[PDB]
Amino acid sequence: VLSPADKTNVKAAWGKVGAHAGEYGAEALERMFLSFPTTKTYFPHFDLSHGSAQVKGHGKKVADALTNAVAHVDDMPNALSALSDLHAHKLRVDPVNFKLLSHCLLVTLAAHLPAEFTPAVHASLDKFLASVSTVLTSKYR
């Protein structure tokens, strides 16, 4: 349930994302930490300040992982295995949180890709992100 129409749209948006990916990724986190403090809880060792090179640094990682998923869009479960493990077993993130992070990514994607950010597209990304998350928590259910 990532129809082609869907994959395409995803592709394009992320397409238009390019290099900004890192900063965008960073953007969503800060947005997330700021809008949902409770999530800071997983980043104790972190500098969760307005310009953390850590936060900068993580944003890239996340994005990089997002790009990669985009790329193996029909093999996520596989392209994401390692991450799924880290997230379920080692970090044990309350599944609830994935909903938050993804809402933050969208919001960011919208404020940066107005022209692309359309209904059809908004719907597609959401589904995408939904999947990525699903996969990231498959280690629970």
Partner 1 sequence: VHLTPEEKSAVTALWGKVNVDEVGGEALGRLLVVYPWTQRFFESFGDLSTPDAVMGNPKVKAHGKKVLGAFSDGLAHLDNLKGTFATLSELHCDKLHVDPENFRLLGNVLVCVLAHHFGKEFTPPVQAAYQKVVAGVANALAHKYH
Binding residues for O2, as ranges, are 58
| From candidates 10, 113, 132, 135, binder to ligand HEM by CB under 6 A | 132
Enumerate residues 40-69 that contact partner 1 by CB under 8 A: 41
66 binds ligand HEM (CB under 6 A): yes
Cα 43 vs. chain centroid, distance in angstroms? 16
82 binds its own copies (CB under 8 A): no
Give the amino acid at 34. L
| Rounded Cα gap, residues 70 and 64, in angstroms | 10
CB of 130 to its own copies, least distance (A): 5
| Cβ atoms of 46 and 55 closer than 8 Å | yes
Nearer to ligand HEM, 75 or 115 (CB): 75
| Rounded Cα gap, residues 36 and 97, in angstroms | 9
Known binding-site residues for heme b equal 87
